[PDB]
Amino acid sequence: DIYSRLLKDRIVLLSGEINDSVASSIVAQLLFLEAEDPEKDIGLYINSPGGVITSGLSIYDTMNFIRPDVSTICIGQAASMGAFLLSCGAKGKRFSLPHSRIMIHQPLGGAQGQASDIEIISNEILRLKGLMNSILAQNSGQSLEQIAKDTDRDFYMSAKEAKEYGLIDKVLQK
Amino acid sequence: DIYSRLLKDRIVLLSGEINDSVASSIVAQLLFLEAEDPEKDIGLYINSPGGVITSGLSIYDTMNFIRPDVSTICIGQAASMGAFLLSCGAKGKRFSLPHSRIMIHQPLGGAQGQASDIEIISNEILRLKGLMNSILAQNSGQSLEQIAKDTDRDFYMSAKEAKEYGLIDKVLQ
């Protein structure tokens, strides 16, 4: 199998939208590799438009949980939860090919029912918003008022700008 | 025309769901019945499960806009916005038939999109919820805090209970 085989080289591919079923696969491969060699670095290739916040955090927390260093490489694009995860790679090990597009924004959600229930949801998504603007600030080196301002609406950046910004460490060139 | 004929006797019927459409028709009828006689009383019969809030408030304000006294009579049921309008009838002239059911509750709605937008919607709906609990408390003689507590979920009651609660004044036996 093409993916099973590359997994044998410590390469993990995160492609497409994030949801429980996809993060579960990623976590499973992450845990697996650490059981193979809790020392060798891991290559997490990301080309994703984002997805379910929750599912992204499971991946993120697992990346730091295991012992192995997890390097992230952005190919194609890394938007929303994709760019968030990309910026969570081991400091100095965050990469992007030269023509990728990085994008960051604030969370999205829905809410229906009684005003009481809408408030609970409203509050829970705002809690997630603040928590991620903090993790982004921490990962990029930008201030919390800068992450807030830039992520109010979709913020598109090229590989170079993403490095200037602090989301990645180096732009691997041809 | 049946309704057109009862309209002649100052009887306006508010039946079914409340939305802008039915709201603008009730509003019109009330404006009409004022240009016909700003003195005589109007009988607004309500058989409704509720509807759009702003649509509902349009009726409430119009009721207080014109000079005629707008009496309210509950037949069948009056739930949510329906119960709200019933309680907004001219003081002393809020009635209900014996087997009608009145039900009050908190506002319902929805929000979709960015955190910031969900938040704006959440605050607007809460502001609407405060607004109506206030008027509802004002009308039934209950504490703003009591209504919010009693309307957290659907509060059903018979015509009798409704009068004892203060939403109506009398139950025509």
Binding site: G51, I53, H105, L108, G109, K129 | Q114
Partner: peptide, 4 residues
């Protein structure tokens, strides 16, 4: 779900 919740995205973003």
């Amino acid at each position: 779900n919740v995205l973003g």
